[PDB]
Amino acid sequence: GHGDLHEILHEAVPLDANEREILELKEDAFAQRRREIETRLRAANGKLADAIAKNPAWSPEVEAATQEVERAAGDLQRATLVHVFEMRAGLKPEHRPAFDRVLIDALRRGSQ
């Protein structure tokens, strides 16, 4: 699937009042990072479209753009999962098993 892992967790197992206070800095930092990587992904998609518009064949331009798409997507996957682990570190320990239930099940469905 194509689930939004970060959103799934904040919606299904929301932070409590104190956890939200604790996590606010790291949540903001991640929001900025997600936006930056998404800007790169959109730009890479645009380079791939441009390449195929110019010359609709595998080509150096397609090879480079495909790699750039892949790299941005992987950066986003990894950054998101690192931030999921930040969230878990900021939870009260007793909240971690429910968080993990949602996380595990969502990962198995391909959420990222």
Which residues contact Cl ion (rule: CB under 5 A)? 10, 14-15, 97-98
Residue 34 falls in which region: left (phi positive, over 0), alpha (psi -120 to 50) or beta: alpha
The reply on whether position 55 binds a copy of itself by CB under 8 A is: no
> Shortest approach of K ion to residue 18 CB, angstroms?
27
Burial of 102 (0-12, 13-18, 19+ CB in 10 A): middle
Under rule CB under 5 A, which residues in 20-39 are in contact with Ni ion? 27
Q: Of these partners, Cl ion, K ion, Ni ion, none, which one is at the site of residue 112 (CB under 5 to 8 Å by kind)? A: K ion
The reply on whether position 24 binds a copy of itself by CB under 8 A is: no
Instruction: Tell me the C-alpha to C-alpha distance, in Å, between residue 34 and each of 18, 20, 56, 101.
Output: 24, 19, 31, 24
What number of helices (H) and strands (E) belong to the chain?
Answer: 4, 0
The reply on whether position 45 binds a copy of itself by CB under 8 A is: yes
* Of residues 17 and 93, the one with the C-beta less far from a copy of itself: 93
* Of residues 60 and 97, the one with the C-beta less far from Cl ion: 97
The reply on whether position 45 binds K ion by CB under 5 A is: no
